[PDB]
Amino acid sequence: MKGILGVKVGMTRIFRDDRAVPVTVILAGPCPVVQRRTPEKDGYTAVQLGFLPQNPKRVNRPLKGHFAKAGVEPVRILREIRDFNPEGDTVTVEIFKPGERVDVTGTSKGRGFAGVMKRWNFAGGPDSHGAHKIHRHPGSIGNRKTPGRVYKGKKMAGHYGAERVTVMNLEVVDVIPEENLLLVKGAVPGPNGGLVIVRETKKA
Amino acid sequence: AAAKC
Amino acid sequence: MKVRASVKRICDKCKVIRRHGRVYVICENPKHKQRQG
Amino acid sequence: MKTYVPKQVEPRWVLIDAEGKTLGRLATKIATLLRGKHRPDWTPNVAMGDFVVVVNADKIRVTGKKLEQKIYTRYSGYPGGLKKIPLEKMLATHPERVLEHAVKGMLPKGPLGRRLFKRLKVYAGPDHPHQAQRPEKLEV
């Protein structure tokens, strides 16, 4: 179990063994170690990692003292990697080698208030043959007098996206330590510029 | 409702 | 296994036993195996 | 003449060991102490019972085949949301809940009964963190 914080850069494709490989580029390193969580004091094992260094004029006193205890420059993002205890005080892309599999967590793009056709892939209504103002409507939401109510968890229109999403078992295609770049095969949640977390996969 | 017969 | 409400010895070698709250007929002839159910 | 009304009194802290006790027959005695019905000045509309500390709750005893046959149920409000947990599993994972559940069902419903449940402190194991209150040991 090991992980690193990063930023989604973009998508392209590379050629390998006469095959086109769609990849997502991620700028990951370097992550200073800010705090370590221990079972003796916290009840579990984790490491708090920092990312995206910040102008000191925007750091308030509670955060400045927190950074000063670790002896690091103030960063913008603080995130924990559960069950990880890095050897040094800084985590880099070198922790990953090509061929390894990773899980990537990010915040998916936000669709706002979305209808049942987009949020839940509802069939909707007919577009001709007398259909009356119900083309994108959900249809029936229940039964009669029994039970005379709507179940909890009923699929309805509402906020869609802008939520935490993890994609599992992505293959690491290339590691470029000069520019702190990690290449993973396939697609990663969120927009370009959004924060992501790359961890060793839970699959086997 | 309509014709109920 | 035969599962029925009326379990009885079919032949002179059939044996009636009770295990875990159920009546069974067990016998050397595999056709004679029975459970009450 | 009018019936005597007690004035507020500092309450008593009591310590009970649950080692080897029958679950239901112990829960009855606890519920009586929480209600304060052992006091000649008992009043139905005030909280005037004892604070009860229980230790070794994981070592409660049950008769028959209740370890595999007694089922606790929880309903989540979702379709198919009825969860069933046998007693032996509850003892392994949340031992304190078994005695807590038995006592709660024996208290009056409503605001006062909810407060009385707050005065019960159940621990699995022989130690409790209430040494400052100095609970006097009681034989049940």
Next chain:
Amino acid sequence: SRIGRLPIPVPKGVSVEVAPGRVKVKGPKGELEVPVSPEMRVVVEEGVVRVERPSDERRHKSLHGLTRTLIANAVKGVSEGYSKELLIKGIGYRARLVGRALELTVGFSHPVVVEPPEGITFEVPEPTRVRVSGIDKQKVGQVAANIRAIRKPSAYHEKGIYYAGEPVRLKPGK
């Protein structure tokens, strides 16, 4: 017409110390613990162990027979031992011994290896004969049953893994 009233003719080299709810047997082959119901009294005398029951109802008559035979099995185990013999039959089927673990070639696409548990010893005098030995009658029977369950005797052919002395009963297939 009883089982629990007979004392156990314990031989020398075997020492049995009674205990609350337990009987500890020590011999030249090893030691065994035999949990005895506290509802009964076990007494050890000169070269004899005898079990008595405290009443005459169904439960105490049932435990009297159970208590004596288990102790007698334990004392026999640490004096003479216990064994079970398995036969492997079929044209290509056979067995061999890998280190301490046993090897089965029983017509699967892969070989099957069995790791003996603690207190159990394997012997392969012939490729078509396996012996299981140990001090525990329950474990000897269980381990022998485990190996037989790998390839049970066929109902149409004289092929598979059989107990010593197990009769062969076939039915026509054509």
Next chain:
RNA sequence: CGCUGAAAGCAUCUAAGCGGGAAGCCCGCCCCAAGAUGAGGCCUCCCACGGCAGCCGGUAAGGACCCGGGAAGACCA
């Protein structure tokens, strides 16, 4: 489906005890979650101003208003 084994000298998967065994059950995977009023935990920051388990002000660490915006968004957040 068994191992050991009584009652019932035999036998028996059972009465004591111990194993094997399902796309099913409990964890495990992903997501939400301390209004979990049982309101949890850890790191850092601020300090004992004045005037008389409370009342009136001036502040601290911080926050809000306002403004430029945003793959965030009905408004709000």
Next chain:
RNA sequence: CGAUGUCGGCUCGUCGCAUCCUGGGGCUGAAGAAGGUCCCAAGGGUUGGGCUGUUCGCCCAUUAAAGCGGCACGCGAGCUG
């Protein structure tokens, strides 16, 4: 009866198990393969089309299979007519 809208279709489901498929077993008049019958099992799944307003049924081409029922014969302040 100072009103409880009635078939079929569509949409949206959810539940039961007397189980259609998939998982696990006993027996077989079980050589093998393919079946028959009973037991356990409701997690998931259970196609497209022609005829007819049809439900139902028949037919075509498939499939691991093309289950049976409840929910005011589920669902018109959701649509159709």
Next chain:
RNA sequence: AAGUCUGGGCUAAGUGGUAAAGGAUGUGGCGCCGCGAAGACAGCCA
């Protein structure tokens, strides 16, 4: 609200706390008969 009251017995199924014909070495209690050191039932050699 008032007996974790007293004495004797039964049940192990949470039966009690939702059903029939039928089936069964469940368990407790009583009986009628048979064969029994004119050595019996079971086990073992026939």
